[PDB]
Amino acid sequence: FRLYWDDLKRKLSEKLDSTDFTSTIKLLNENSYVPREAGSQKDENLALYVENQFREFKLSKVWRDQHFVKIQVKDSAQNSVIIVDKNGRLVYLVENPGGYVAYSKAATVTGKLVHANFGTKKDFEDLYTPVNGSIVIVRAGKITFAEKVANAESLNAIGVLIYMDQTKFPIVNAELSFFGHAHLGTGDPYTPGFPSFNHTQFPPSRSSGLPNIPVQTISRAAAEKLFGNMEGDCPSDWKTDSTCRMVTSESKNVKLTVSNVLKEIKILNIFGVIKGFVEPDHYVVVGAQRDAWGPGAAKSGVGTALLLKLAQMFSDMVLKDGFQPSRSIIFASWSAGDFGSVGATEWLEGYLSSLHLKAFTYINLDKAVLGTSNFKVSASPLLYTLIEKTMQNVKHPVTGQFLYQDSNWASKVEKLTLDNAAFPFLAYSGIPAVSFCFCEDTDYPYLGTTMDTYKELIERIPELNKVARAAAEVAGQFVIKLTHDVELNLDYERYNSQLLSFVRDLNQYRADIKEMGLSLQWLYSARGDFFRATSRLTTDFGNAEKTDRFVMKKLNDRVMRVEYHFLSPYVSPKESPFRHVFWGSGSHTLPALLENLKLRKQNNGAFNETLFRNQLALATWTIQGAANALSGDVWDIDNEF
Amino acid sequence: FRLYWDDLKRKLSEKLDSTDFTSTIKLLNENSYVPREAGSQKDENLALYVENQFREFKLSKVWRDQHFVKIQVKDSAQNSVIIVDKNGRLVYLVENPGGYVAYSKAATVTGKLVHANFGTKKDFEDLYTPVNGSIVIVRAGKITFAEKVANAESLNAIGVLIYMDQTKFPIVNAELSFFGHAHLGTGDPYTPGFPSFNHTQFPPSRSSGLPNIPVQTISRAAAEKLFGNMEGDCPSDWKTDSTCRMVTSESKNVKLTVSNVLKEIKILNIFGVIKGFVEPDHYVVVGAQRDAWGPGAAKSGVGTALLLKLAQMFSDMVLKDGFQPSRSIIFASWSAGDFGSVGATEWLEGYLSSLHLKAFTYINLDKAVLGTSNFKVSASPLLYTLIEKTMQNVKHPVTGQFLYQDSNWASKVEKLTLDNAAFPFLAYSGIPAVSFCFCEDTDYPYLGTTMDTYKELIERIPELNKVARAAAEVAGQFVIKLTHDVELNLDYERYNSQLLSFVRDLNQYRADIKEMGLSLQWLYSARGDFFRATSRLTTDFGNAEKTDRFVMKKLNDRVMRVEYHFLSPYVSPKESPFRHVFWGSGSHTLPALLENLKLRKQNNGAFNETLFRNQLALATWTIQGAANALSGDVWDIDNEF
Amino acid sequence: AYLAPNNLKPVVAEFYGSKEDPQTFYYAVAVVKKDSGFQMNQLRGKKSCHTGLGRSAGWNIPIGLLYCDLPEPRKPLEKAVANFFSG
Ligand SMILES: *[C@@H]1O[C@H](CO)[C@@H](O[C@@H]2O[C@H](CO)[C@@H](O)[C@H](O)[C@H]2NC(C)=O)[C@H](O)[C@H]1NC(C)=O
Ligand SMILES: *[C@@H]1O[C@H](CO)[C@@H](O[C@@H]2O[C@H](CO)[C@@H](O)[C@H](O)[C@H]2NC(C)=O)[C@H](O)[C@H]1NC(C)=O
Ligand SMILES: *[C@@H]1O[C@H](CO)[C@@H](O[C@@H]2O[C@H](CO)[C@@H](O)[C@H](O)[C@H]2NC(C)=O)[C@H](O)[C@H]1NC(C)=O
Ligand SMILES: *[C@@H]1O[C@H](CO)[C@@H](O[C@@H]2O[C@H](CO)[C@@H](O)[C@H](O)[C@H]2NC(C)=O)[C@H](O)[C@H]1NC(C)=O
Ligand SMILES: *[C@@H]1O[C@H](CO)[C@@H](O)[C@H](O)[C@H]1NC(C)=O
Ligand SMILES: *[C@@H]1O[C@H](CO)[C@@H](O)[C@H](O)[C@H]1NC(C)=O
Ligand SMILES: [Ca+2]
Ligand SMILES: [Ca+2]
């Protein structure tokens, strides 16, 4: 027979009202798995358990992939933060922090302490007190740890202490510690660009992101002792508590000591695959982080629960029920996502020549269930219409409403931040990536913490089974909607609104661009060329038969590589890996061009005019070249005559 | 009544028995087209003639392309050379040279003079006197001009003079002066890596290969007057005239002045296509160079004449006869092919997105006819088996026997030289290429001079028509063999001998690789994995149906990227463009690794150990990466265990 | 017929009226049996005979009038029409 869509979402709900996620999240929180740093023994026992499950669910092929990396772990000596008097006589200590920061430096220093809000660059340039030569304190949240340490390194400070206030993070236990990686960029930093297998023989190298300054996480109650000695008031624009103070008194000054040692540990990745029936070699990757520093049920528990239950569900629907996919599906559990996601980045840098142009969507199940109120998504624009249709099918878990309440949601979507694990798929490799969370308005309090566990998780969310049912239902709609049909549901219309947003952002500086002696018109015509390419492609889907396969493969290959052609071909992938000109990092991306252009008006001398000429030429020709490559053969490009 | 290979070969020979090349070489040498500098008016009339002919042969789409390039022409002040003493008061004028080197820096300098045999990198150690602080002379031939200026510039010289002796280049006229470009690399230099279109705003950028020293060409009697004052004697290894001498007298001195100005000119490329019936978007490119500094009868007339006649035969044979090619064919006429062939390189860097995996062969019809004694081919190794069969089916024009006379010719073949127009395609874009000449034992003497005219070419080669007929037959054999059948004739197993030759070359330095503390054996295993890759792919071509199209498209997409995966993905295309790990320039290719290990046995202190270990890691993982990309999918590896 | 990979085109049309006043369109009608007493609205579950799948007067206009009166799943159309018309 055949199974169409409306039959098939019904079959998913009938498979989905039977499964139980709560028992599995208890299972990943037992005493045989509960502390699992990367490379530890409990990680390898969990990887044997998952790699047993992918065999028991009758997957088509299950395989393991291991490689050796360098992480940083605590030393046998303690690291402390300790108040030093001006006399040098009586020495008072505040905390021996249980939690540490990855990729910091082994050092020990003294000096003045200066409060900063979050370590935004705006904060450091809004400060009154000069920053240099002085240890700083910041509050965790709103930015990755590595960009706090990056800004505090650019302003020539020595030390960084990071804590959690009560206003942003309301908790009861003031004596609590946590964890974070400090590497700007991702991947294993001691092998950038090339993968960390055992064929490279590990040449000497180092990344660019690693700071040269000691970083340390302190608790709230440690921050109250330091704020007992400081003076000068926090300004009222900081939505903060009543205790924080700006700089130290002139007598006392703190002493930070941080002592961490490198380690070289073995990383396992477990995979299992479901084959396709029309085109088996094109596939779609579904992932989840397998470990976390503390007990870790919010970070890696719910991801591995959703992953195991989804692998059971689709293997059962293909084997027993009669569902027939057209493309393969890869389910994946990698470890070491907590050190800036090296388990995924070392895989992408491993096999990049084989999943060139083959893998067409990555899905992230990680951090799915945190809050119960809202629904937040972050994705490549190619997937937006897809998510829109899914928000018109799935019901809310708490109330009976649908998710599609706000009909204007494409602007509220924020781009993928670097601490997300779907970022090296989109920005480095060129795969359209999607992540989502049921998240409360304030972020989840104990998320990288020793108190992250199932007890306090079920205290926050009183109905976890229904919400996990909803999130697995949404990922089910994404996989089935991407795989059952001959037409991909990647919507290439969506980059056009991004381009209109960019050139519209450049029209307000046409007055400064006209003073340099160079015009802007070729970039308008580049936007227009991308419009006519997408419109021509839509009409060519209009005239194609649907049952025919040879005339739909030639139109699907043009859809698959509209994401690859926005990667810049004019940069080196070792010197800067994230090459997506929209959503990247460096001097080549398009908001880097805007952020170069607005500094000309202030007339400091920080603008670099030759750099702006090269950035305009390379951005204009990258967008124009994607617009050539989306529309037709070579001879059907119309030239300027 | 379908057409198979036998009917189509005799149909092509029935076409070649009729056409008359000699009238068209006499027609591209008429007084209305004869001096063809790049961008000058006399190029334009030929360009409209070639576009007009391509419309007249009923090609399926004829289209053209124009963009603006910086060349460097002679100023109104005459550059010259002169002999002075230490004061400058002694003045004896040698000559005023007609010819000039493009891209030589504009400066005036004095100095003593040192000889070198060609400016090979081996020569300056074998030379007796120190080179620095002094002008050099070199003798024209055996390497490009840019490698002479790059070597003598690399050893701190000041100026380079270039002459043609009587032994290597036997010419009666002792007055003749000549031309050559000095850019190390290819293309328009002032836009490195991005196209010269006026979409790109023309940003200030300067290529890293341009020289810093004044370079000049002198005639033969102009060289002997310098050999009168210089005192010494050449070694007897240098087969030369009796009158060469090494260095100047001690009271004597040589000053040369060079004045050349930049000009901005307009470049045309003229194209036509023949559509394909099975797969239209895959195409094979056939090119030619349209302009040359002298009259240009051997350098541009023969290539363009062969191109126009192949357009006549293939469009005639598709329209009237009933041939049905399964893939498209692009005919191309590049201009400014003489300043490093900037037409082709700006064409690739313009349309690299649209050519990604589409084009899969270039054929270079340039300088096809130079003599009548040998047959010298130079190609990327996927074409070697093809050339095998073609050399068994083309009779030599003088003696009636075939061209495949030596059964071992794959080792005699030299790699593609940088002045050849196929080298930006193969080295830069990863497209298989081929060039071929009927070269004499000694090279064609007056190639880039003002003496290159027609009647000298018919006096040197007495039967131009049969030789041009043989080269047109070889090109017709290639084009039909690639575009008649369901199977591509790109033989992929020929890379196995190349990898075996590399590892067998490193296996002598295994004794020092064991001293550094790293083993070689992973690279042995990488060669092994590429062998089992091409074996498994030959099995998959075994077990498939030939009539079916959907499976042979899936295999031909896997063969068509066996060349793209040898482009190294760790270096910037704008900085070092020729990214091909075998056949290209830089510090990343395999000869640079063999060299950078070979330096260590000298124990000079010049080798760079970190750069070595880094090079070995990247080259090993590149070869293993192509081996993974051939054999199947992500799950059929056959990884570590 | 004009969809890729067919790529076709009408070359000769035909006219239906008298010769002196040529007519190039044809009306579409729905024939019933007398005294059955069901309207266009109360047509549910009655048997019907078509002239073909995809022809103009047979499939596209009669189903084209009433396809939005059917309940979802809308596509594939022959399934929901198969559950609208009994037999
Ligand atoms: C892959 O590389 C790792 C890293 O060196 C090797 O693992 C080490 O092997 C040495 C000697 O056998 C021992 O110190 C340990 O077994 C490993 N060290 C650590 C820190 O784990 C491994 O042997 C390599 N694999 C192969 C096949 O050679
Ligand atoms: C501004 O851009 C210019 C671009 O030329 C930079 O200048 C040179 O850039 C090249 C990059 O290829 C470097 O190798 C040189 O060392 C740079 N020279 C100097 C003097 O900096 C320049 O660095 C950029 N930044 C500023 C602040 O001027
Ligand atoms: C694109 O670029 C070319 C070259 O920079 C421009 O041509 C020049 O135009 C100016 C102004 O009319 C002339 O003074 C120059 O002589 C032209 N160059 C040459 C080589 O003739 C051209 O105008 C630009 N714009 C367009 C639309 O083609
Ligand atoms: C040998 O290779 C090393 C590694 O590249 C070179 O050392 C540095 O290379 C970086 C580029 O990554 C450049 O900043 C400089 O060339 C070097 N930086 C230093 C020394 O601080 C080194 O130059 C190479 N050559 C020699 C002779 O050692
Ligand atoms: C850097 O810090 C020192 C601390 O002693 C201070 O005196 C100095 O003014 C600071 N530098 C600048 C440029 O303000
Ligand atoms: C460069 O030339 C000067 C004089 O011409 C000489 O003294 C010096 O030794 C030369 N350099 C080297 C490395 O020999
Ligand atoms: Ca790596
Ligand atoms: Ca260029």
Side-chain angles (χ1 to χ4, degrees), chain A residues 522 640, chain B residues 68 198 202 264-266:
Chain A
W522 305 110
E640 65 177 356
Chain B
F68 297 93
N198 200 347
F202 294 153
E264 189 175 3
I265 62 166
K266 180 173 72 176

Coordinates of all heavy atoms in Angstrom, one line a residue, chain A residues 522 640, chain B residues 68 198 202 264-266, ligand 3:
Chain A
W522 N 25.8 48.1 -7.4 CA 26.0 46.7 -7.8 C 25.5 45.7 -6.8 O 25.2 44.6 -7.1 CB 27.5 46.5 -8.1 CG 28.1 47.4 -9.1 CD1 29.0 48.4 -8.8 CD2 27.9 47.5 -10.5 NE1 29.4 49.0 -10.0 CE2 28.7 48.5 -11.0 CE3 27.0 46.7 -11.4 CZ2 28.7 48.8 -12.3 CZ3 27.0 47.1 -12.7 CH2 27.9 48.1 -13.2
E640 N 25.9 42.1 -17.9 CA 25.6 43.4 -17.7 C 25.1 44.1 -19.0 O 24.6 45.2 -19.0 CB 26.7 44.3 -17.0 CG 27.9 44.4 -17.8 CD 29.0 45.3 -17.1 OE1 28.7 45.8 -16.1 OE2 30.1 45.4 -17.7
Chain B
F68 N 37.6 44.3 -17.5 CA 38.7 45.2 -17.6 C 39.9 44.8 -16.8 O 39.8 44.5 -15.6 CB 38.2 46.6 -17.2 CG 37.1 47.1 -18.0 CD1 35.8 46.9 -17.7 CD2 37.4 47.8 -19.2 CE1 34.8 47.4 -18.4 CE2 36.4 48.3 -20.0 CZ 35.1 48.1 -19.6
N198 N 33.3 44.7 -13.3 CA 33.1 46.0 -12.6 C 31.9 45.9 -11.7 O 31.2 46.9 -11.4 CB 33.0 47.1 -13.7 CG 33.2 48.5 -13.1 OD1 33.2 48.7 -11.9 ND2 33.4 49.5 -13.9
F202 N 36.8 47.4 -8.2 CA 38.2 47.5 -8.3 C 38.9 48.0 -7.1 O 39.4 49.1 -7.0 CB 38.5 48.4 -9.5 CG 38.1 47.8 -10.8 CD1 37.8 48.7 -11.9 CD2 38.0 46.5 -11.0 CE1 37.5 48.2 -13.1 CE2 37.6 46.0 -12.2 CZ 37.4 46.8 -13.3
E264 N 45.0 50.3 -18.5 CA 43.8 49.5 -18.2 C 43.0 49.2 -19.5 O 42.6 50.2 -20.2 CB 42.9 50.3 -17.2 CG 41.8 49.5 -16.7 CD 41.0 50.3 -15.6 OE1 41.4 51.4 -15.4 OE2 40.1 49.7 -15.1
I265 N 42.9 48.0 -19.9 CA 42.4 47.6 -21.2 C 41.1 46.7 -21.1 O 40.8 46.3 -20.0 CB 43.4 46.8 -22.1 CG1 43.8 45.5 -21.3 CG2 44.6 47.7 -22.3 CD1 44.5 44.6 -22.2
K266 N 40.4 46.6 -22.2 CA 39.2 45.7 -22.2 C 39.5 44.4 -22.8 O 40.1 44.2 -23.8 CB 38.1 46.4 -23.0 CG 36.8 45.7 -23.1 CD 35.7 46.4 -23.7 CE 35.9 46.6 -25.2 NZ 34.8 47.3 -25.8
Ligands
LIG3 C1 33.5 49.7 -15.3 O1 34.9 49.8 -15.4 C2 35.5 50.4 -16.5 C3 37.0 50.4 -16.2 O2 37.3 50.9 -14.9 C4 35.0 51.8 -16.8 O3 35.5 52.3 -18.0 C5 36.2 53.6 -17.8 O4 35.2 54.6 -17.7 C6 35.8 55.9 -17.5 C7 34.7 56.9 -17.4 O5 34.0 57.0 -18.6 C8 36.8 56.2 -18.7 O6 37.4 57.5 -18.5 C9 37.8 55.1 -18.9 O7 38.6 55.3 -20.0 C10 37.1 53.8 -19.0 N1 38.0 52.7 -19.1 C11 38.4 52.2 -20.3 C12 39.4 51.1 -20.2 O8 37.9 52.6 -21.3 C13 33.5 51.7 -16.9 O9 32.9 53.0 -17.1 C14 32.9 51.1 -15.6 N2 31.4 51.0 -15.7 C15 30.6 50.4 -16.6 C16 29.2 50.5 -16.4 O10 31.1 49.7 -17.5

